[PDB]
Design a protein around this ligand. Structure first.
Ligand SMILES: [Zn+2]
Ligand SMILES: [Zn+2]
Lengths: 6, 167
């Protein structure tokens, strides 16, 4: 996951 | 001059079946078809032509009936237990960095709007948008996250539901 998170 | 998958000279003593697509003739024997068996299929379609037909299903224009199909396919996806993350655009409030990470966002509601306005001209364009949904999710979310697993499951489902879509 490249994202900070949901 | 040479015929059939076996590339041999024409022999008039042998039973041939003709492919209604390319009009080439094939030894019944080489295609696993007896004469009595050939009088039960109306249109023989040879190995080479058949795989061409298979390949071109995603490229031919979407008919009015195909559009009925896309609507059904979309509805079954929206109803799937694992489709909850994909129903609407990601909310920036839930994932503040999302629209900075994901360059081409996609979701099922956007795809429904696109089907509504007949945006798709070939099946491959619909598949491309669906694939974006899953690829984005797997890109943004860690592999051990239920979001990622939801993408894995839903893509597998979709690929199944697309079999025998087109006439
Ligand atoms: Zn053929
Ligand atoms: Zn042959």
């Amino acid at each position: 996951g490249k994202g900070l998170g949901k | 001059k040479l015929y059939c998958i076996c590339k041999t000279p024409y022999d008039e003593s042998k039973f041939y079946i003709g492919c209604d697509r390319c009009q080439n003739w094939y030894h019944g024997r080489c295609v696993g078809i007896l004469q009595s068996e050939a009088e039960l299929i109306d249109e023989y379609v040879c190995p080479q032509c058949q795989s061409t037909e298979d390949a071109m299903t995603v490229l031919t224009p979407l008919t009015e009936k195909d559009y009925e199909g896309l609507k059904r396919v979309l509805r079954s996806l929206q109803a799937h237990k694992m489709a909850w993350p994909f129903l609407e655009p990601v909310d920036p409030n839930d994932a503040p960095d999302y629209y900075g990470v994901i360059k081409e966002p996609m979701d099922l509601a956007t795809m429904e709007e696109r089907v509504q306005r007949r945006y798709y001209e070939k099946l491959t364009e619909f598949v491309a948008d669906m694939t974006k949904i899953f690829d984005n999710c797997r890109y943004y979310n860690p592999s051990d996250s239920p979001f990622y697993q939801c993408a894995e499951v839903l893509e597998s489902f979709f690929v199944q539901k697309l079999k025998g879509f087109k006439a």
